[PDB]
Amino acid sequence: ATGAAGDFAAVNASDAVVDLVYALGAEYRANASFVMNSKTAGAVRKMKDADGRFLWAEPARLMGYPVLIAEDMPDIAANAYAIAFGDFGN
Amino acid sequence: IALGLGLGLA
């Protein structure tokens, strides 16, 4: 869980992405992928540091891990599961 | 020191 109900966490945003990555298992992260929809990927790319620069660096990968833009996952609601991550091939 | 609004040291 991220923290705050609507958005990501308040004081420390985007570690929800990191502990989700490093709570997935070491062998599954060897070939894993994020799955999101487009208006969640836009909100993740809009996340930025204390200065105004977006903190993340054609498959549009995140943290080196590939990203599958679906159109059928829920958007960022109060209790929605907008971002998934893992080795879907296994 | 400078012109921010930041509760900070300098």
Partner: protein, 84 residues
Amino acid sequence: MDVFAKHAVSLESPAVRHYEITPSDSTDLARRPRALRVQTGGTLVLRDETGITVTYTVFAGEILPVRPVRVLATGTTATAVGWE
């Protein structure tokens, strides 16, 4: 509706979360604050994570950008509210 919702909250950033502190005296704070807004002027004692403590003769409405682990109750005459 905040336009700064996507922005990260650094130590230099303004106070998002505030909570009033009690002079707990050998029980540490729940969350250590980025800064202390003083409510009533006086003296208050503050301990670091390294353990050394000094008395601060603080004034009435000052913010002091210190990040204390525990506020003791021996010499604390001043009420403050933490900012984080």
